Amino acid sequence: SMQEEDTFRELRIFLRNVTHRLAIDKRFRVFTKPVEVPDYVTVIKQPMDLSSVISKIDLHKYLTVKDYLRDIDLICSNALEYNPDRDPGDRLIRHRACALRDTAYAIIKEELDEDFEQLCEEIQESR
């Protein structure tokens, strides 16, 4: 229905705004573009980055905030797995990756209405 389509459009508008606020943050520049380094493709089976997230929003791939946060969590978990060493370069990326994840979750906790996320879930489960 039109009411359901309007609901998913509001979700996309919200997700674009959150992703924009993450992508303009200087700490998260490393996560804004797809991966220069030839061993990434063999360590990371599903690359994810904020530009790819924006593309998925516009392709209507996220019907719930949980769908979106799964890809934020993938950005973070990929970074922790590809950068596990004690070296300062690894530790810096791990710190930024957890900050990206924590920032996304915090924006959603403070700004997304629980009843709006619940409606999205109940429409998606009906399909």
Ligand SMILES: CC(=O)c1nc(NC(=O)[C@@H](C)N)sc1-c1cncc(N)c1
């Ligand atoms: C989802 C909703 O807010 C809604 N609202 C209505 N009434 C209204 O006056 C419009 C302006 N909300 S009808 C309707 C509705 C639409 N598609 C499926 C189901 N289950 C309900």
Ligand SMILES: CC(=O)c1nc(NC(=O)[C@@H](C)N)sc1-c1cncc(N)c1
């Ligand atoms: C597309 C993307 O990944 C993106 N990257 C940015 N990078 C930066 O600002 C620098 C600091 N890395 S800003 C930004 C962006 C995201 N959503 C909406 C708009 N208008 C821009």
